[PDB]
Structure 1
Amino acid sequence: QYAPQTQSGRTSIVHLFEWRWVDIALECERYLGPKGFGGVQVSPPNENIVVTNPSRPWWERYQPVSYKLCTRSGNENEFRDMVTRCNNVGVRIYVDAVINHMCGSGAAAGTGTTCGSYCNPGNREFPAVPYSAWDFNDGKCKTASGGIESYNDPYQVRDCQLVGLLDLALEKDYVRSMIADYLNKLIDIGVAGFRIDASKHMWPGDIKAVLDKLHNLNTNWFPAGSRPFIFQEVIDLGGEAIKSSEYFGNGRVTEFKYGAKLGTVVRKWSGEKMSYLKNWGEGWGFMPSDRALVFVDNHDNQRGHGAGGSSILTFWDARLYKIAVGFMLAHPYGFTRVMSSYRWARNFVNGEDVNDWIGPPNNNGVIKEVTINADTTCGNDWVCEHRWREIRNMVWFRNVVDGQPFANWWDNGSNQVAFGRGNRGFIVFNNDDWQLSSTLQTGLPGGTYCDVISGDKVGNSCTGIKVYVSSDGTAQFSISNSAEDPFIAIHAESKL
C-alpha cells in the first residue's frame, strides 16, 4: 503493497505515457527530481506484438509476446539506465505489468514483434517465455464464444478472453511463477512497484499468489524490508458484479469513480455543483483513501469512451482540466497520479473518436524524442501537462501540505469553493458564471503568499498574484469567471 515507496515527502507519480526510456531518464534528472515528483509510471516494458493495421497503435503494447525488456521505448540496457538514473535523483519507476493475457488470439504467427521473438498465437505458442497451450484458460472459459459476453458473471470476466486476448491460466503455479520471475527481475533492477493491468479480469487470489513471490525492493535505494507498491487497475464505477473491494488484500486499487464524478462536477453536468465536493472522498462512496490510486484522467479514458465517458476531463479541456487536477492535488484523499500525454488528431464520428488508436508521436513508427523548449514546454506534440505551471506547482503544493488535515471548507452554495490543509496551504476555486469576491479564513499564518497558479515565488518576489493574509488568517480572494485560471493556491513555501 500500500505504501507508494516514493522518497519521503514526495506525494505524486506521473504517467509518462509511451515515453522512451532515455527521455524519461533525462526527464528525471532535469525536471522530475528537482521539482519534487515522486515517480513515473512507464508504459509496458516487455516485448509486444507489432500491429500494422492500424499502424502501431498505442494499444499494441497491451498484447505481450514475451517478457524481454525490448519495446519501442527501448532495450534492456536503456531500461536499466533509466531506473538507475531516476532512482539516483530520488524519482521512482513503476512498471505497467501486463500479466492477464498475451496477444490477440487471432494474430498471425511469425516474428512481427518488438524484439523479433517468434510466437504462434493460433497454437498458443510463446517460446520466448515459454508458454504453450497448457498455459491458457481456453478450457476453463464456459461461454460459447470463448469471450467475455456478460460482465454480470465474474467467472466469464476472469476466465474468458478480453477482446480476443489469449487468457493466461493464472491458477497454475507455472504461470504465476513465470510472471513473478519477470516482475522480480524488474524489482532487482530497481523498480519500486507495479500497475497491475486488467486486474478485474483476474481472480484476487491468483494475483495474491503472484505478489507473494515478489522480492523486497533494491536496498541500493530503498530501506531493507520494503515491499513493492501495488496498484491494481479495476474499473468499478459501482453497480456491477465485481467490486474494487475484492482486491484490497493485494494492494491499492484505481478509483475510477474519482475522475468520472469529478469531471461531471467540474463540467457542471447532471445538476452537479462544486459545492457538493465538501465531503469528497469516502463521503462520495469511494474506497478508503489508504487503498486508493486517484487521477483525473488515464491513458484509456482520456480518449473518451472509457470509464467516465465524455465527462472525463483531459488536456483537450485545458482550463477546466487544471481546475480538476488542482482540486485533486490539494485534497488529501488518495495517492495521486498525474497524466502526461501526447496530442493526436481526434475525429469524432457519432461521438466516437475513430482516431483513438493513434500511437505516440513517431517518424515511421519510431517514437520521437521529447524536446524541451525555452519556456519549459515540450515539442514533438508531447503535451507534457506535468510541466504546466498550474499543475507542477500543485504537485509541489501536495508535498508541502503532506499530512495536514482537510480544513476550513467554504462554498457559496453553487460552484465557488475553498479549503485548506492544516496550517500549510489553502486553495480557492471559482467555477460559477459570475465574480468571486470573498474574504475567507485560510488557516494560514498572516503574511504575503505568492499564488502558485498564476506565478512563482522567486527570491523575495512573486511573479504572479499576491495574497495578503491577515493576522487572523483571513484574506480576500477576487477571481473573475473570465480568468484564464479561475483558482488560486498558496502554501507555506510560497510565503514571502
Structure 2
Amino acid sequence: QYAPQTQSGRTSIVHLFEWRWVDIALECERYLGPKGFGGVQVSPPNENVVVTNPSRPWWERYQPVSYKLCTRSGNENEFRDMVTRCNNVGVRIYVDAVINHMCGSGAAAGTGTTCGSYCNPGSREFPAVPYSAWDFNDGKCKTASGGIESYNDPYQVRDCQLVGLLDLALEKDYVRSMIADYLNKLIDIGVAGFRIDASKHMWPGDIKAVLDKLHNLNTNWFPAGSRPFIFQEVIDLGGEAISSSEYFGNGRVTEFKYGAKLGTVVRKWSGEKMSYLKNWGEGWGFMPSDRALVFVDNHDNQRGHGAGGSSILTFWDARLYKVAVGFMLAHPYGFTRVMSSYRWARNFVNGEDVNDWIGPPNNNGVIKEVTINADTTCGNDWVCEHRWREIRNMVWFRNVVDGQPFANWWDNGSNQVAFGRGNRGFIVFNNDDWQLSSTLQTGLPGGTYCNVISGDKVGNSCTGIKVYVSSDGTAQFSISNSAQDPFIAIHAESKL
C-alpha cells in the first residue's frame, strides 16, 4: 500500500483535475508517457448528483448517487480505454474514491444525476447501489443538528454529516462490501491505486476493513501479488483531535503541513526565510517521508480557503509557484503530486473568492476538450502546469536524481539557498531582493551542464543558461533577483 506502483524510475503523479477520459488517454500517449510522468490522479469516475445552482460546480462530483462509471468526464468505455492506453505507455491511473458519504441530505428526489439514476436523499434511498436508510450513520451521530458541531470530538467528525452529506455506516459489512466491489471493478480494469477522499471523516479501522477486500493489481501490467497504492486525504495541521498517524496502517497520508509551510516560507511571511529549509522534512514536524504524499497546492486549497489558507501558492502566482514546485521536486522528502488546473473568473468579496465553485471550462455544462497549442501550451482555459518547462523539467530532474541523498546544502543566511542530490543533480535558488553571484560546490563531475529551468538540452547544445563545472565540482551561479525564474537546476542528463 505505500508503494506507488509507478513504472520503475517514474517518481511523480499529476492531478488532471476535471479532465475528460478521452483527453487523459491522449495526454498519456503524447506527453505523460514520453515525458516520464509516473501517473495520473483522475476526478471521481462514479456517478454524481447534478447541481444546477450554482451551475455545475466542481464540488458536485463529491456528492455520489451510485457507483456507475458515468460522469462529465465520460462513460465506462471511455474510462476503460483511458486506463488501458495509459498503462500501455507506462503511466498509472489513481482513482479519487469518494466513499465516506453519498449526496446531500437536502437534495430533492429525482433523476437530476449524471447518469439518470433515481435517488431520494430525504428517505436515504439510493436504488442504483442499492443503499437504504439503514446504511447510513443517522442513528450513530449524537449531535443535535446531525452535523459535525465540534472537530474536537472524533466521534462527531466520523459519524456525523460533513456539510450535510449523507454519512455511510462503514462499520457495516454490507456497506464495506458495496464499496469494495466498486473499487475491485476499478482494480480489475487496471487502476493502480486510490486517493481515499475525506479520510478524517471515517474510522481508520473501517478503511482497513474495506482495503482488506481489495484484489491484487491486474497482471497485464503489474507483477503478481501487487497491492494497490493507497493515499488518504487527512487534513491535519497539528493541534487537532484526529491525527494523520492514526491512518499510517492503511497507507500513505496527504501531508498538508508541507504546502502550508512552504507557501509561508517562499512568500517570506511570518518571518520565514528559505535558509530555514535546511532541515525541511521530518525536522519541521512532518510525518515520516515513507508515509507522505506531498504537494504545493491541491484542487481544494488552491481556491484560497483550504488547509493553509492564503499562504498556499498557485498558478496565479506563477513565478513563486514555480520556485515552490521546483523546491519540492528536488527535495527527497515524500512522494510528489503535481497539480494541473483550469482557470476561472475569481471574484473576491471581503477577501473571499465568491466564484470558487466554478466548474471546468464548458459549453453549457459539457466539458471542453483540451487543445494543445504549437508552443505546447493548452487552450480552452486549461492551465496545464504540468506542461510548463520549469515544471516538466523538474519532474524529470526528480526521476534522474532518484535515490541520491540530500547533499551540499548552502545558504546565505537569508533567502538564497542551494543543495544537491548526490552527484546526480544540483539546484540553486535566489529568493532575496539582491543579486546572487557565488561559486558553489555542486557535487557533480566537471563538465558543461544545461540549466533545465531556462532551457533544454537539444542535441549537443543548450537553449538556455549553460553552467560550467570545474573538475573539483565547483561552479559559479549568477542569478538576478529580477530573473524571471530566480533559480537554476542542472543534472546528470542535462550535461553536454
> TM-score interval w.r.t. the shorter chain?
over 0.9
C-alpha displacement at 1:220, in angstroms? 0.2
Q: Distance in 2 between matches of 1:482 and 1:149?
A: 49
Q: Give the corresponding residue for 1:79.
A: 79
Measured against aligned partners, the alpha-carbon deviations of 1:23-75 in whole angstroms (never above 9, x if no partner) come to: 00000000000000000000000000000000000000000000000000000
CA distance in 2, matches of 1:283, 1:165: 37
Q: CA deviation at 1:80?
A: 0.2
Corresponding residue for residue 90 of structure 2: 90
Query: Structure 2: which 5+ residue stretches go unaligned?
Result: none
Separation of aligned partners in 1, 2:301 and 2:170: 27
Which residue is 1:154 aligned to? Answer: 154
**What are the Cα deviations for residues 266-325 of structure 1, in whole angstroms up to 9, with x where unaligned?**
000000000000000000000000000000000000001000000000000000000000
Show CA shifts across 1:189-220 (max 9, x none).
Answer: 00000000000000000000000000000000
- 1:108 Cα offset (Å): 0.4
Q: In structure 2, what is the Cα distance between the partners aligned to 1:401 and 1:89?
A: 22
Q: Any idea what SS the aligned residue of 2:302 has?
A: helix
Q: Distance in 1 between matches of 2:441 and 2:206?
A: 50
SS in 2 for 1:427: strand
CA distance in 2, matches of 1:460, 1:227: 43
Post-superposition shift, 1:414? 0.4
The 3-state SS of whatever aligns with 1:41 is: strand
For residue 381 of structure 2, what is the aligned residue in structure 1?
Answer: 381
Matched with 1:186 is: 186
Moved over 4 A (4+): none
CA distance in 2, matches of 1:217, 1:441: 44
Per the alignment, in what secondary structure is the counterpart of residue 409 of structure 2? Answer: strand
Q: Percent same amino acid at aligned positions?
A: 99
Determine helix, strand or coil for the equivalent of 2:257. helix
Superposed displacement of residue 186, structure 1: 0.2
CA distance in 1: counterparts of 2:5 and 2:112, whole angstroms: 37
Deviations 1:151-171 (A, max 9, x none): 000000000000000000000
Q: Could you give the per-residue CA deviations for residues 455-479 of structure 1, whole angstroms, max 9, x where no partner exists?
A: 0000000000000001000000000
Q: How far did residue 351 of structure 1 move?
A: 0.6
Rounded to whole Å, the distance in 1 between the matches of 2:64 and 2:85 is 26
For residues 210-263 of structure 1, give each alpha carbon's deviation from its aligned partner in whole angstroms, at most 9, with x where no partner exists: 000000000000011100000000000001100000000000000000000000
What SS class does the counterpart of residue 449 from structure 1 fall into? strand
- 2:319 aligned counterpart, secondary structure: helix
Does the residue aligned with 1:417 lie in a helix, a strand or coil? strand
Q: How far apart, CA to CA, are the structure 2 residues paired with 1:289 and 1:460? A: 37
**Is 1:12 matched with 2:12?**
yes
Measured against aligned partners, the alpha-carbon deviations of 1:309-362 in whole angstroms (never above 9, x if no partner) come to 000000000000000000000000000000000000000111110000000000
Q: CA deviation at 1:411?
A: 0.3
CA distance in 2, matches of 1:160, 1:14: 32
What does residue 458 of structure 1 align with?
458
Q: Does 1:368 align with 2:368?
A: yes
Shift of 1:384: 0.1
- In the aligned structure 1, how far is the partner of 2:259 from the partner of 2:386? 17
What SS does structure 2 have at the residue aligned with 1:352? coil
For residues 310 and 348 of structure 1, what CA distance do their matches in structure 2 show? 13
Q: Partners in 2 of 1:173 and 1:399 — Cα distance? A: 41
Counterpart in 2 of 1:100? 100
Secondary structure of 1:494's partner? Answer: coil
Normalized against structure 1, the TM-score is what?
1.00
Q: CA deviation at 1:389?
A: 0.1
SS where residue 493 of structure 1 aligns?
Answer: coil
TM-aligned CA deviation for residue 416 of structure 1: 0.3
CA-based RMSD: 0.3
CA separation in 1, counterparts of 2:168 and 2:351? 34
Give 1:493 deviation, angstroms: 0.3
- Residue of structure 1 equivalent to 2:24: 24
Query: 1:340-379 alignment to 2 at 5 Å?
Result: 340-379=340-379
**What displacement does 1:150 show?**
0.5
- State how 1:16-55 maps to structure 2 within 5 Å: 16-55=16-55
Give distance in 1, aligned partners of 2:242 and 2:467. Answer: 47
